[PDB]
From a paper:
Recently, two isoform enzymes, ChaC1 and ChaC2, belonging to the γ-glutamylcyclotransferase (GGCT) family have drawn attention due to their ability to cleave the γ-glutamyl group of glutathione, resulting in 5-l-oxoproline and cysteinyl-glycine (Cys-Gly), specifically in the cytosol. ChaC2 exhibits a 10- to 20-fold lower catalytic efficiency than ChaC1 and is constitutively expressed and involved in the “housekeeping” GSH metabolism. Despite their low sequence identities, GGCT-fold enzymes exhibit a similar structural fold for their catalysis, including a YGSL motif and a typical catalytic Glu residue, as well as unique features, especially in the vicinity of the active site, which specifies the substrate repertoire.
After several rounds of iterative model building and refinement of the SeMet-derivatized ChaC2 structure, unexpected electron densities were found adjacent to the suggested active site cavity. With the native ChaC2 crystal structure at a higher resolution (2.3 Å), we were able to finally determine that these electron densities came from the loop region (residues Val60–Asp80) of the adjacent ChaC2 molecule. There were three ChaC2 molecules in an asymmetric unit (ASU). The ChaC2 structure exhibited a mixed α/β topology with nine β-strands (β1–β9), three α-helices (α1–α3), and two 310-helices (η1 and η2). The ChaC2 structure exhibited a unique flexible conformation with loop2 (residues Val60–Asp80), flipping out from the core domain. In each ChaC2 molecule in ASU, the long flexible loop2 protruded from the center crystallographic trimer and formed an unprecedented dimer with the adjacent ChaC2 molecule, which we call an open conformation. Analysis of the oligomeric state of the ChaC2 structures using PISA web server also indicated the formation of a stable homodimer with a relatively large buried area of 1349.4 Å2, covering 13.1% of the ChaC2 monomer surface area. Furthermore, Lys12 and Arg40 from one ChaC2 monomer formed salt bridges with the side chain of Glu73 from the other ChaC2 monomer. When the structure of the crystallographic ChaC2 dimer with flexible loop2 was superimposed with the structurally similar enzymes, the Glu74 residue in loop2 of ChaC2 was found to be located at the dimer interface and structurally equi-positional to other active-site Glu residues in the structurally similar enzymes. However, ChaC2 adopted a unique quaternary structure wherein two ChaC2 monomers exchanged their loop1 and loop2 structures, resulting in a more flexible and open active site cavity.
Residue numbers in the entry:
A (entry chain A), B (entry chain A): 1 to 82, 84 to 177
The structure:
């Protein structure tokens, strides 16, 4: 099966994937409304990471990865499509390359119901919080930069108003 | 986290593991009571694969694998310890090497409640069914041989009465 990576997976490429395609999905928008206490932040001082939200006019550029078929032959691992703030569903992924027809992919999403969801907030604020945060995975700012730098390698900044704006405010903070 | 492989994982080594240790666990016994329709058998002509059953006098030799920390920084993947015929729990794993202290490991088990559970049966029968079966993964007999040959590389045949007996009956069938 193929899964869509709208975040860290884009650049955190050290995992096993049979194949990958740059592309985009629809009807969702990428927002930094997901709190991070185990990666780019910690409890008591959470960081912000991305999640996808339903947006009819929405688009999200990212990368689709083909997971290797599982080795354990004794149990049937399953997919639960429902589940406690994290959603699993599928959506159409459009490859950047027109040579490939669009195909279904798995989407793993953290909902408004997940415990870590921080929700929408003024960008001024999100940027600062990101500025300050650091977690087991690294600093919050590095996460944003990679993503942003990461997306730019694939599309014009117009593609993600929210992400690039954030990057810019942060860079400004880094100034003063 | 570390997971215990009592089956195919022992020899199907083409996956990513940070580390591995030969060892054994207790209070469970390995039996060929699990039906296979997606690996070593198919619907309408199922094969047999191993599952672990609670056995107070029981022991299971196998290998423990250290899974790599997950790359996705956006969602919290969880462990559900309860779940529809497959159980997830932990048990003590004793390394063959005394230099290492015993440690907890994850055990993923298919219960009597799973749909594919075929249950106990006369060994004469299981061997034949295995003889005949083939699935997406390969023939049923190859699965048994690898396991058996696989275990022997780690312990005397006395360790697994059930597995080696089965191997032998099968080899006999292969004769006539």
């Amino acid at each position: 099966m193929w899964v869509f990576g709208y975040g860290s997976l884009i650049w955190k490429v050290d995992f096993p994937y049979q194949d990958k395609l740059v592309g985009y999905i629809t009807n969702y928008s990428r927002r930094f409304w997901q709190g991070s206490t185990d990666h780019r932040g910690v409890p008591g001082k959470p960081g912000r990471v991305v999640t996808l939200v339903e947006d009819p006019a929405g688009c999200v550029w990212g990368v689709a990865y083909r997971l290797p078929v599982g080795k354990e032959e004794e149990v049937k691992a399953y997919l639960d499509f429902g589940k406690g703030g994290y959603r699993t569903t599928t959506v159409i992924f459009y490859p950047k390359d027109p040579t490939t027809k669009p195909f279904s992919v798995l989407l793993y999403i953290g909902t408004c119901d997940n415990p870590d969801y921080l929700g929408p907030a003024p960008l001024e604020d999100i940027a600062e919080q990101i500025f300050n945060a650091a977690g087991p995975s690294g600093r919050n700012t590095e996460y944003l930069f990679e993503l942003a730098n990461s997306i730019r390698n694939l599309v014009p900044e117009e593609a993600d108003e929210h992400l690039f704006a954030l990057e810019k405010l942060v860079k400004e903070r880094l100034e003063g």
